[PDB]
Design a protein around this ligand. Structure first.
Ligand code: ZN
Ligand code: ZN
Ligand code: ZN
Ligand code: ZN
Lengths: 190, 187, 188, 189
């Protein structure tokens, strides 16, 4: 029954209007659902992992730097969590069940110790939230699948810039990864 | 020197009576997939056939798709001229057959090890399906620091909108180069 | 309560007197204990993974370090002693696996971790040869992958007693492994 | 270009008053480890400091039962010992120098080391630090499985137990096919 909720890249740079790689409106639209579900997961005794892009300026060795403009730079406000989710972190970030995790690839597992931390705790299910549905959420989900985790996707708490991409990703999660789609109350959606 | 990965282009995925057939669009790439494989082989590239090998109540994929590519069945035989190429050159030191259980060609296999032994920097992806075993393989390759090439006329999906999502993902997110059956970049 | 026992390279080439990479007397001495403990684990309901060297290869760094051994399709890959009989009896059981490997570690380039995770196995029990090479590498990989570890002391062996002793110390003190006897009871 | 890995050469592992000190043998390599690191840097190599980062009362870490508290985040225990420390003050902000926190013994486990190396097409890793038979050994084995050529700087690795140091060196040479080199990065025969 040991579960972990993963909060992926829900920062000012991905969500806010002035954000450097902002998803804009669709990302902002999930603010209430993402904060509610994360607070709920925490209330249920789940582990919470904030897995956040930590980029550097002039990282010529990173293939991502040629693909997107500078975003989520180390030591910038762009890395601040957006909305009430940010308030949640300031309140509960010191709790032994809440984690902040820097990542450099899209997937929350790549080059991090997420798998190690989950295995230490004998977690068998990950609950995915954040942005973008078809990039960092999708990559994290695929890695989770290959690492043998059960997957839940919080449908109203994931978002993409592109609606067709969001739809592809949701279908992929359900039909290919065998993931459970859930709402903000963590109830399965049929 | 690069490596061409041939993903799941078997009877069960391609033939009209295949257990998990992609049908017409998978059949449509037969000429292109075999042309580009022979071409890559001609110019000294390594060839990795990464093929579903299914049996298995502990595999989560059992719930998601009907039995396909079962061991010892003709369903695992490579489709078309690609099977002919393997019959001719499967024993060449640069050609490989790898059994896999997940979608990604890297998951639970020694693909990364074999590529690293040969100091390969670039993988060229062919096969089916674009949005499942090709997409998963591409993403694993990206995370493992490989340069990626996708042979656009040698990948196929059941649904054209999924094939289009995957192609866009390769270019815009993974930084892959889309190439034609002559291994020339597309513009 | 269900665990996995890993049976590492206990084959003719590593054990038999004419073996291509034979560990000789100390490897032969564990034959009774390794078969006893494997049968006990299987009877208990545990999963059994035979993780066996499958060699061919100028590209393999190991080819320069050891003479040819456990070559694919040769008798050097046959399991040694009563262990071979257990495999004849139960090799087709859904709980028993034969796994080819190219590195020393049973995890490296294999699907061992995946198979264990499918089954929610939290504890691996290690047996076989050599204590300081394929058992050590496998133990280290298991540790980094968050498995609890048991080492069957009378069912592991090395060519050199000092290497065998180093490895056993490393398992207990660094990896936090439980050392057990052939009855799967902890040793004190 | 190669990468030199500097493993756990900190106060807690080296200094007389270190919480998990290897003592005199670890102190004895201070000159060699600092010399070889400055040399690798001069030669244009990448330098990775891979340093234990433990927390007090981490009940979920299996290492917590095995050793007393050591290299705690925000303590002096994590300070690089000797001239290596001075080198880090001098060049830590350089593009080729990296500081990597680790929780397991191996420098690769749960880190982005492999990712950073492959971004640079590094094919050979040069290993230094402590302990020879624990964080150096684990790092070497991980490097081997990941297909890296390995160099071990013999006078720049140390263990608390000399027999364990001897086992590890033999293992590197005979099992991993590593090249043993001196503080001048010249092969030892
Ligand atoms: Zn990013
Ligand atoms: Zn399949
Ligand atoms: Zn071998
Ligand atoms: Zn430590």
């Amino acid at each position: 029954m040991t579960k972990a909720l993963i909060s992926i890249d829900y920062t000012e740079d991905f969500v806010a209007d002035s954000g450097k790689l902002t998803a804009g409106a669709p990302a902002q639209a999930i603010s209430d659902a993402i904060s509610k579900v994360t607070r709920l997961a925490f209330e249920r005794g789940d582990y919470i992992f904030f897995t956040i892009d930590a980029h550097e300026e002039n990282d010529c060795f990173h293939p991502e730097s040629k693909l997107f403009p500078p975003h989520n730079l180390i030591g910038t406000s762009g890395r601040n969590l957006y909305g009430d989710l940010g308030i949640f972190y300031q309140e509960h970030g010191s709790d032994s069940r809440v984690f902040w995790m820097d990542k450099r690839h899209y997937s929350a597992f790549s080059g991090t110790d997420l798998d190690i931390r989950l295995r230490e705790r004998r977690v068998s299910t990950v609950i995915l939230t954040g942005v973008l549905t078809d990039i960092c959420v999708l990559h994290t989900a695929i890695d989770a699948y290959n690492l043998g985790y059960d997957i839940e996707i919080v449908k109203p708490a994931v978002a993409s810039i592109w609606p067709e991409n969001h739809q592809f990703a949701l279908g992929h999660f359900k039909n290919t990864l065998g993931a459970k789609l859930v709402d903000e109350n963590l109830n399965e959606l049929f």
